[PDB]
Amino acid sequence: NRAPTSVNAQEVHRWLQSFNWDFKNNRTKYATKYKMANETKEQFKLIAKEYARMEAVKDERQFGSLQDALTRLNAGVRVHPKWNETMKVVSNFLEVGEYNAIAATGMLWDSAQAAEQKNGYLAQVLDEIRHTHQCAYVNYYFAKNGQDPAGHNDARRTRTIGPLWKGMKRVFSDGFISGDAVECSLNLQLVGEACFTNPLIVAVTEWAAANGDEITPTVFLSIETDELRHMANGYQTVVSIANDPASAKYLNTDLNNAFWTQQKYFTPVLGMLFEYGSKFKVEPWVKTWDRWVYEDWGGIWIGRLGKYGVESPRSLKDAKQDAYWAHHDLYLLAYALWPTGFFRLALPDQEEMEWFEANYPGWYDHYGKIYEEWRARGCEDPSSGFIPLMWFIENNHPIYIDRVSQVPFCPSLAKGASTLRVHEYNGEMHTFSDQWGERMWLAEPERYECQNIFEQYEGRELSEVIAELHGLRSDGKTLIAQPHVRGDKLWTLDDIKRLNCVFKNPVKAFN
Amino acid sequence: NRAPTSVNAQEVHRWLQSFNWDFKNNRTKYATKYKMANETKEQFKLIAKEYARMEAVKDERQFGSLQDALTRLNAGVRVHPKWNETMKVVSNFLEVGEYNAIAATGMLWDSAQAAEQKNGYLAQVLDEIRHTHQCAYVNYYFAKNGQDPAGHNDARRTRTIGPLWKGMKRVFSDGFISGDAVECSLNLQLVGEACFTNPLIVAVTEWAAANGDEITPTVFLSIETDELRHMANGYQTVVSIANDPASAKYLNTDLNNAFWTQQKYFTPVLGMLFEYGSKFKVEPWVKTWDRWVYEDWGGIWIGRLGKYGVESPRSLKDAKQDAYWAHHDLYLLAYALWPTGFFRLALPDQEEMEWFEANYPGWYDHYGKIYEEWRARGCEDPSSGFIPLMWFIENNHPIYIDRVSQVPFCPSLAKGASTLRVHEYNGEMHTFSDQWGERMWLAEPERYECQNIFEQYEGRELSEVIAELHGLRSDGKTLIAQPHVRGDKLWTLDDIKRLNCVFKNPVKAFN
Amino acid sequence: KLGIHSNDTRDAWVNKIAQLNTLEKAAEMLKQFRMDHTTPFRNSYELDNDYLWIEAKLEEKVAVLKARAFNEVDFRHKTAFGEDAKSVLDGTVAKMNAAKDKWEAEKIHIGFRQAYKPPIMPVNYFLDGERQLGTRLMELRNLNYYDTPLEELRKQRGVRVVHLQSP
Amino acid sequence: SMLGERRRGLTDPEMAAVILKALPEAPLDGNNKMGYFVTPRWKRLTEYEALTVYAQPNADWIAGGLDWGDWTQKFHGGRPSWGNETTELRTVDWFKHRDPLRRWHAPYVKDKAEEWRYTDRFLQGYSADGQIRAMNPTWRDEFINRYWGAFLFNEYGLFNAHSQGAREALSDVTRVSLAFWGFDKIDIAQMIQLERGFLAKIVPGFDESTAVPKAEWTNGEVYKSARLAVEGLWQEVFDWNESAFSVHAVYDALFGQFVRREFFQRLAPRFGDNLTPFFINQAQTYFQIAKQGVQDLYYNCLGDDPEFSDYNRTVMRNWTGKWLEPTIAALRDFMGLFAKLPAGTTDKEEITASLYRVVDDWIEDYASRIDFKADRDQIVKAVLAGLK
Amino acid sequence: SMLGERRRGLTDPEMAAVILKALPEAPLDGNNKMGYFVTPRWKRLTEYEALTVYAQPNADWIAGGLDWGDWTQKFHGGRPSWGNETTELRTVDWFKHRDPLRRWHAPYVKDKAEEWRYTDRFLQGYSADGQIRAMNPTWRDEFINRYWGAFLFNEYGLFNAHSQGAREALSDVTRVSLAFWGFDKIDIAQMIQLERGFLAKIVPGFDESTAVPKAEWTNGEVYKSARLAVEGLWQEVFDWNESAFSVHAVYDALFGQFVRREFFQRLAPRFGDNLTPFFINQAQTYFQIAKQGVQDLYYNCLGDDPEFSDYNRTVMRNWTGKWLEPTIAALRDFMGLFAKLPAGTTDKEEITASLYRVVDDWIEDYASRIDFKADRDQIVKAVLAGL
Ligand SMILES: [Ca+2]
Ligand SMILES: [Ca+2]
Ligand SMILES: [Ca+2]
Ligand SMILES: [Fe+2]
Ligand SMILES: [Fe+2]
Ligand SMILES: [Fe+2]
Ligand SMILES: [Fe+2]
């Protein structure tokens, strides 16, 4: 009779589906072509209290490791210089993905009509807040205990200087919250996390460990335990709308668009950060990509949803074709524009060129020689008066920015895709790098009006832009970004000014 | 108003002293010669709830580091074999010191009459409980993830086989609880903790790190934070009796007896564990001991209690003279009796012998030559039929156990003290190694009746004792203890049985 | 003064806005601004790098003036132009539902934003419109999304093909 | 294997040597403070601020933003990912807000977790101690099961009212506070059900099904206007600030506080019910924690904005007037519940005084902050009309 | 410097290489389970048992000991550090006891710390929410401050009663439990004062001084026999088991539970006081926690000991009888407290119902375990005679 008794989460969750009630205006406030099933269920039976507890336990182990042992081992310092820089980008860029995912799932929570589906999205809303604070903590920790705090300590504002940031906001910010809630869900859960994010998070802990970084594995491995639950949400989105006629009409189109959007950015960027932002290599991007996208995702994961009308993205073939040299094509551009970043970059060393050539036949004859020339031109030395961008100008190799994906491309030099489509519309010029992004713009002109760095910086001298956007170190003179990762001979704002580099919009050449 | 309001520990502790009330039998239940003033205050204004919170926070970090990053780094394995073994003794032996300290402070809590002094000892009661479990956790963790669990997994029973354990119980068990509460307080706090334990805990984290052990530092550094609190208790114990006339008549003799008791064991044992149980050295024990005992404790610490009538132990100079070679003399015995331990020992390698000679001129001519003689004879090879105890017998070097301290000593071989006093009393022989312990027994014969290993094992064949007391590894054949730290050629119960070693009480040689 | 966050163009508009001290005048300038500088149908791209910022500064002025001029009921239910918000919302949605194709629908939605974006129309009605108009627009646009060849789509959009490159 | 196959740069001799050799002699910048450019609200920058402020990638055209340019991808039609157009309120900087309790994710789940584990211990001690024996049966089966139970739907609706804000909030600090205000509401709804589930285990015949509480909420009279208000606040409000403001600084501040504190918290104890007050203690703790954040955002930041103070107060006054009427109606209908109580439980004077406590606290904590001229006796008189 | 001067064997290339080279190929024993030789109380050995059982270095001459030989150093006179002579009870093994809650230090401070922090939050909300406005002034200034405060000296005395057990307990598992039982008692006493200190902060003329509540305890009539039973359990008992048994399975189970649960926890609510019950909720959660440990030691282990079952039950029945008298007396004196309550607060029918709740729960939870035949009616009457 007086036996110690209590109540658990599942016991309360049993009645959660009944919490919602009917009334005329009980409907999503967001535009959508789909209808989410009113009796959709969720995989995990959680309530606020239990959610907090399981997450609190993870924080304990994580922060305990970071504040105690890892700090005592000077783990924040004993990491390869190139990797310390790579994490400035990796952690802050992923941070924004985590952040926008909060808003995105708040939007899905609004979309779902079944109490259980709302609750599933709700747990993700809280998880993405945790992940935002976690990625933030990684930069916070490396800034406080690492070899180079610059960039780690102000990325939220210094990332605005460079072009790589624009593409990140497309796939991990706007792509997550702007559009049909279902389209957003595909970018976030069905494609983003399932195809790239989750495999990426794990991969990063491996590359991190290999390069001496035990900070990232501690945090990211914890982030990973939460992501295993976010898969259920993405899968549940498709289930909730499969019994609706609209699905057969629009689902595969939103998915294909979502797939191309995500891949377009991560195919070249992830491989770039992995192979060029590390000393010790874990695996060639070419094989990693094919396993992630073609096999795991585009085969296993996608196949399971065939029973819901889901098909393999029609652009998958093109994606593979353009994928091979993509990241290599991009690093040339990222290094050439190194003064616009918030991180230090390094030319491939002798050993690395062998690895690249060994894993990518033909790399040396193209990229290898180019880097060797830039080195000869003094790209690493501050008194050289040389920046790779100048080389692109001298050899008439214009760099364009895709109006849709924001991904930088140089068709006249790339070994990969060399397509370029230029249109004039109502007094504005537009440059596209592929047939999928071009269709997106033609069909949805008003969704893609993002001004590119050349448009914004047109007629502006390089050093003035860097200075205005706070791209300097605490001494107020040395640049945050560097063309090498050594501790001496760091470029200053004055070294940049002397180059007298003035941006120009490459599209203005067209008549 | 309605402004958020609460109450802290201090605000409640403000009235803690008034919690006790007067009544006939409100007095200590333990025999004592002193009177602890009932107006005595404590340094820290804690209440049970705040105490738990500050400790809970420490556990968080500690366990987080252990279960997460440290485990991910395989910290339990990448430790020098000699150190893995040394931690079996260090952690378990200190554990009993932590454990009896619970009872000791419980006895001191009963002794104190002022509510605040009682509260001070109480906080320690709980701390000593935490330290018991912390030391336990270290063995638990090395057993779970280490290169050799035997010993770590069962020290609580396998430690009863060897002689080093008897002396540990004298200073860290019985010394802490058997006698006048104040005497125990001096063995525990004024001497044990202030002179040895505290400096030792920190030192251990230093030797641990040098030998690859990051587990112990994570735990021991946490224990240290609590110990900085127990200093106030020992100090307040003196302040509580300084006004009682009995103090001027007893304090200094109980202290001197307490000093000798503690140093008698730690002087040789700690130096041995540090210098012989490690590969990488941190500092010569002669230097360490002098700083700890003479400079820090016997000088600064004790010096500040002078205003309370406290005088430097009269046996101090005696302790310094017997110290120099003490740990070196004892390792010869510990190794000669290696089959009686619960850990594996190693002889000094070439680099170490050079280190010993450099730091202890004359070391090689005595200890070095002996070790090389034993090794060439095959003391490390189970097919040799040789155990160093035989060499002691052959060369007529009897090994005695001090009736008071339980410390093993061999006066005919020792390079250190070689005095020996043998007495008979009512049909029993007694062996003493110093003039202070001899007085203790003469004045208090009923306090010291501990049987030594030769008395208990008299006439018994070595392998039977080991088998009976479970000195075996999982396979039921291989000994836990070993004369080397390599993974091959481990001695078995059979190898020992064939030696036909039978214990004899050495004192009977006098008849 | 040609900065990213601070420049002469922005300063000039701040001064211009400082002189809009009447609701009708301010509201009219805001709508005109939107027709001239926003969406792919803007009359010109001359303020491309600063229009987003200037538009917000213009909105602030209209908002402040509207709150001072309107009684509580009108602030909640009328547009800055004195129209009844519900009527405008319903009328626009009705037109959207009558839209024959995706080309007609996009003009309706886009024009609605240009003319009624807060603080012209009350946010509650405006976002309710986004909800309804956006739905139809997507339904029309996403149907057989890939059927029209790019060659023909460029013509439908009416772009001037300046340059085409292919490996 | 014992050592494993994967070599780690931090511990692998060969790799670590390579890493150490490439290291600089000292940090390439001495400013090791992430978020150093953030204006601290207090003496020094807090961890809360560093890990949170400016996480939202707003461009300068959204007050306070540090980025530049339009969003990369917008909604069909052109609607921006985030924009000024989603709320009537204006400000000099959307990043000014600060949760006075400085709650980022870690401290937030830590505290709730402590409350969860303690709640579980409490229930086991309560059931094991047999304290249910002294609880009045009628209060338990009628008022806790049906009426307290029906209130779970009120809290659930307020929770859902936050969905659009989680998506539209114009800054990180406001989004995190809003997320937490909403999460605490769903928690309370779940604690009401938790209690009903607990009672069903220690009280034979007690049905934990939500059918009865839900029928009370959807079709009863006592909560009719309350439900009508919640339905509006949740689904008829498309402005994220009107939603949060009206919910926390109007409806929940008056109706919510009256129901939780002046009815159940106040009367449960009179029927031997220490069970319900345990959970209401959590609800009130949450209410007071949210109040601080609600006040900082709407009064300290917006209502006192250096450039839009007058405008924002005008708007919030408008909202207060808009939602005060439906709130009075909710309270008015709720008055009907007093006639259901056993005779002598409470009287008109007690009820009126308790009503004045809620209204006076509301005027002090909210209305007065924006100069809304509330007439306390007129408000109470209007509510008292509901006393059957 | 950035790297520091101290080289660590886990990360230093040279040192680590030496360590790795000395490592065996695989662990020298597959038994990686510390405490593996301990007899599991449950399906599998718990962390609680592994880290606790056998920490106490007892020799085989103390039922259950694994060590051998006498102690190394004893008291003047010859008294052993620990010995069978410190308690009447006997057993086949002193290490049999098991805390049902499996509390070692870590989980213990974790739980109390959560309670401390939630307590802080509760008070901040309570004060901000102005809930004090609905509390009865007389109940606050007279029954909470004077009579509830006085009871803190009761819990405090019970706390101290554990001092000797902390020194004499014959096993680790029993010592840890005893320690926690006592620490929770001092916590409650400190919580009573915390409430008075809180009231002091939000109630302008409230005095937190223990003067009033102390004088009530020391020279009052309400707690006279209560204090007499406390001074006895604490300073007149020298048997650690008698002290723990008599305090938890007799006195506090009767007097304590009636005062906490049946008087303040039952009446405070009627005066608009949800504050006091917030703390009594803790004291009760604690009481029920300690009860499981008390039952497992004296009933499951000693009372039902395979060899001394009869013997121990006799001794506990003796102690029950020995202390059931001072306890019943303490209750009677407490009864005079109702007279000071406002008219109509409670009737004799309610108290009789409450008294039987305490007595019946006692018989079902303790008395019946050792075959102590207690008469519910006579006890209730002797107590009820105090009105
Ligand atoms: Ca032209
Ligand atoms: Ca009605
Ligand atoms: Ca009345
Ligand atoms: Fe995430
Ligand atoms: Fe996720
Ligand atoms: Fe300790
Ligand atoms: Fe200590």
PDB file of N, CA and C and ligand atoms in Angstrom, chain B residues 97-98 101 105 124 127-128 131 188-189 193 197-198 223 226-231, ligand 7:
ATOM      1  N   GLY B  97      43.862   4.600   5.097  1.00  0.00           N
ATOM      2  CA  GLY B  97      44.141   5.786   5.881  1.00  0.00           C
ATOM      3  C   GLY B  97      42.911   6.675   5.792  1.00  0.00           C
ATOM      4  N   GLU B  98      42.333   6.756   4.596  1.00  0.00           N
ATOM      5  CA  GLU B  98      41.130   7.563   4.388  1.00  0.00           C
ATOM      6  C   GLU B  98      39.985   6.963   5.199  1.00  0.00           C
ATOM      7  N   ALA B 101      40.243   7.344   8.959  1.00  0.00           N
ATOM      8  CA  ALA B 101      40.126   8.766   9.249  1.00  0.00           C
ATOM      9  C   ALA B 101      38.649   9.095   9.495  1.00  0.00           C
ATOM     10  N   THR B 105      37.798  10.926  12.901  1.00  0.00           N
ATOM     11  CA  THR B 105      37.088  12.200  12.975  1.00  0.00           C
ATOM     12  C   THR B 105      35.724  12.016  13.649  1.00  0.00           C
ATOM     13  N   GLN B 124      34.819  16.690   7.953  1.00  0.00           N
ATOM     14  CA  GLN B 124      35.934  15.807   7.625  1.00  0.00           C
ATOM     15  C   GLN B 124      35.464  14.354   7.575  1.00  0.00           C
ATOM     16  N   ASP B 127      34.236  13.966   4.251  1.00  0.00           N
ATOM     17  CA  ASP B 127      35.332  14.041   3.284  1.00  0.00           C
ATOM     18  C   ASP B 127      36.122  12.736   3.253  1.00  0.00           C
ATOM     19  N   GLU B 128      36.437  12.201   4.430  1.00  0.00           N
ATOM     20  CA  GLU B 128      37.207  10.966   4.500  1.00  0.00           C
ATOM     21  C   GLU B 128      36.443   9.816   3.860  1.00  0.00           C
ATOM     22  N   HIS B 131      37.053  10.294   0.196  1.00  0.00           N
ATOM     23  CA  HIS B 131      38.421   9.922  -0.146  1.00  0.00           C
ATOM     24  C   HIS B 131      38.587   8.417  -0.168  1.00  0.00           C
ATOM     25  N   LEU B 188      46.732  11.706  13.027  1.00  0.00           N
ATOM     26  CA  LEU B 188      45.971  11.989  11.820  1.00  0.00           C
ATOM     27  C   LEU B 188      46.225  13.349  11.188  1.00  0.00           C
ATOM     28  N   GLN B 189      45.838  14.402  11.894  1.00  0.00           N
ATOM     29  CA  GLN B 189      45.950  15.760  11.374  1.00  0.00           C
ATOM     30  C   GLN B 189      47.257  16.532  11.561  1.00  0.00           C
ATOM     31  N   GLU B 193      48.656  14.100   8.284  1.00  0.00           N
ATOM     32  CA  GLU B 193      48.200  14.944   7.185  1.00  0.00           C
ATOM     33  C   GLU B 193      49.085  16.155   6.899  1.00  0.00           C
ATOM     34  N   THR B 197      50.818  13.034   4.485  1.00  0.00           N
ATOM     35  CA  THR B 197      49.720  12.858   3.534  1.00  0.00           C
ATOM     36  C   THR B 197      49.526  13.970   2.512  1.00  0.00           C
ATOM     37  N   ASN B 198      49.343  15.200   2.972  1.00  0.00           N
ATOM     38  CA  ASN B 198      49.120  16.298   2.043  1.00  0.00           C
ATOM     39  C   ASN B 198      50.251  16.506   1.037  1.00  0.00           C
ATOM     40  N   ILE B 223      41.123  15.210  -4.266  1.00  0.00           N
ATOM     41  CA  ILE B 223      41.204  14.884  -2.840  1.00  0.00           C
ATOM     42  C   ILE B 223      41.935  16.015  -2.130  1.00  0.00           C
ATOM     43  N   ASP B 226      40.017  19.017  -0.790  1.00  0.00           N
ATOM     44  CA  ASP B 226      39.326  18.757   0.479  1.00  0.00           C
ATOM     45  C   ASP B 226      40.286  18.821   1.669  1.00  0.00           C
ATOM     46  N   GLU B 227      41.497  18.296   1.487  1.00  0.00           N
ATOM     47  CA  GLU B 227      42.484  18.269   2.565  1.00  0.00           C
ATOM     48  C   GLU B 227      42.921  19.643   3.061  1.00  0.00           C
ATOM     49  N   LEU B 228      42.896  20.633   2.176  1.00  0.00           N
ATOM     50  CA  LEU B 228      43.268  21.994   2.547  1.00  0.00           C
ATOM     51  C   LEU B 228      42.273  22.505   3.584  1.00  0.00           C
ATOM     52  N   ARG B 229      41.233  21.714   3.818  1.00  0.00           N
ATOM     53  CA  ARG B 229      40.182  22.054   4.766  1.00  0.00           C
ATOM     54  C   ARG B 229      40.445  21.385   6.117  1.00  0.00           C
ATOM     55  N   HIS B 230      40.972  20.166   6.076  1.00  0.00           N
ATOM     56  CA  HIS B 230      41.246  19.395   7.284  1.00  0.00           C
ATOM     57  C   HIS B 230      42.390  19.948   8.123  1.00  0.00           C
ATOM     58  N   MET B 231      43.195  20.817   7.520  1.00  0.00           N
ATOM     59  CA  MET B 231      44.311  21.431   8.232  1.00  0.00           C
ATOM     60  C   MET B 231      43.734  22.238   9.391  1.00  0.00           C
TER      61      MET B 231
HETATM   62 FE    FE F   7      42.003  14.446   5.659  1.00  0.00          FE
END
